[PDB]
Amino acid sequence: HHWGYGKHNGPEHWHKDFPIAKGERQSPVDIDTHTAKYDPSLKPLSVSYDQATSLRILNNGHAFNVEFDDSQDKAVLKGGPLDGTYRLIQFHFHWGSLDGQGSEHTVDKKKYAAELHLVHWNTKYGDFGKAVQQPDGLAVLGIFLKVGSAKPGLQKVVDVLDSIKTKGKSADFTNFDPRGLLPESLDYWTYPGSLTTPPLLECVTWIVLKEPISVSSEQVLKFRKLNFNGEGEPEELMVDNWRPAQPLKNRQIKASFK
Numbered sequence: 001h002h003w004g005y006g007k008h009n010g011p012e013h014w015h016k017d018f019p020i021a022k023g024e025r026q027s028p029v030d031i032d033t034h035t036a037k038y039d040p041s042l043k044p045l046s047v048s049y050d051q052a053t054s055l056r057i058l059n060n061g062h063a064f065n066v067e068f069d070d071s072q073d074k075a076v077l078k079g080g081p082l083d084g085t086y087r088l089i090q091f092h093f094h095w096g097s098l099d100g101q102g103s104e105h106t107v108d109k110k111k112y113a114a115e116l117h118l119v120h121w122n123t124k125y126g127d128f129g130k131a132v133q134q135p136d137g138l139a140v141l142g143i144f145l146k147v148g149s150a151k152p153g154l155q156k157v158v159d160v161l162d163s164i165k166t167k168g169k170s171a172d173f174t175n176f177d178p179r180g181l182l183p184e185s186l187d188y189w190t191y192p193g194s195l196t197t198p199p200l201l202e203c204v205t206w207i208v209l210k211e212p213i214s215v216s217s218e219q220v221l222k223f224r225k226l227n228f229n230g231e232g233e234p235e236e237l238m239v240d241n242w243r244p245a246q247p248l249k250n251r252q253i254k255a256s257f258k
C-alpha cells in the first residue's frame with residue numbers, strides 16, 4: 001500500500017485498494033451550521049487529560065503523530081455523545097500548502113488552515129486494533145486551526161519538527177500536555193463517520209469543536225517544512241495531507257449548543 005496525497009496516489013485513488021472509501025459513513029464531511037440540530041439529550045463532554053503521558057513523536061510519511069501511553073486510563077474522553085470511556089492514543093494534524101486550505105472537515109464550506117485530531121479508543125474493546133473493527137470503537141476530537149496569534153501550547157511540537165523531518169524518523173516527546181491545544185469552549189458538532197486515511201474504517205464518533213484555535217503563521221510554516229519522503233530521497237514537502245469532504249448520505253450532524 002502506497003497511498004498518499006499526490007495526483008497518482010491521493011484520495012481519488014484510494015477506493016481501489018480500500019473500497020469502503022465510497023461507503024455510507026465516510027469522513028470528513030462539510031458541517032452545514034444551519035442544518036445541524038441542537039440535541040438537548042447530549043450529556044456534557046468530559047476531557048480528562050491531567051494524567052496524560054506523552055512518549056514519542058513520529059513522522060509516518062503522512063503526518064506526524066504524538067503518541068501517548070494508553071496502557072491505563074490516564075488521558076480519557078467521556079460524555080457528550082459517548083457511552084463509556086475512550087483512551088487517548090495519539091494526536092496528529094492535517095494542513096495545507098497555503099492558509100486557505102488544510103482542514104478535512106469544513107464549516108459552511110469554509111476550509112481552515114489545519115485540523116488537529118486527538119484519537120481515542122473505546123476501552124470496552126481492550127485495544128486499538130480491536131476497537132477499529134467496531135462502529136463505536138473510536139472517538140476523534142477534531143479542532144480547527146486558524147492563522148493569527150501563536151498558540152503557546154503548540155510551540156513544543158513545532159520545535160521538535162526539525163528532528164523528524166523525514167518519513168520513519170521519531171524523537172522522544174515526553175511530558176507534553178495536550179490541554180494546551182484546546183480552545184476555551186467545548187461546544188461541538190458530532191456525527192458518525194470514519195478514519196480519514198486508509199484503511200478508512202467506519203469506526204469513529206466524530207466530535208468537532210466549534211471554536212478554532214489560533215496558531216501563528218510561523219508555527220504552521222514549520223509544519224510545511226516536513227517531508228513526506230524518507231531521508232536521502234527527493235524532497236516532497238509534507239503539505240496538503242487532507243482528504244476533502246465526503247457525501248453525508250443518511251447522517252445527521254448534531255450540535256451540543258444553541
Ligand SMILES: O=C(O)/C=C/c1cccc(OCc2cccc(CC(=O)O)c2)c1
Nearest residue numbers: 117119129130132133195196197198199
Ligand atoms: O482492522 C484492524 O484491526 C486494523 C486497523 C488499522 C490498521 C492500520 C491503521 C489504522 O488506523 C490508522 C489511523 C489512526 C488514526 C487516525 C487515522 C485517520 C486520520 O489521519 O485521522 C488513521 C487502523
Ligand SMILES: [Zn+2]
Nearest residue numbers: 092094117196
Ligand atoms: Zn486525522
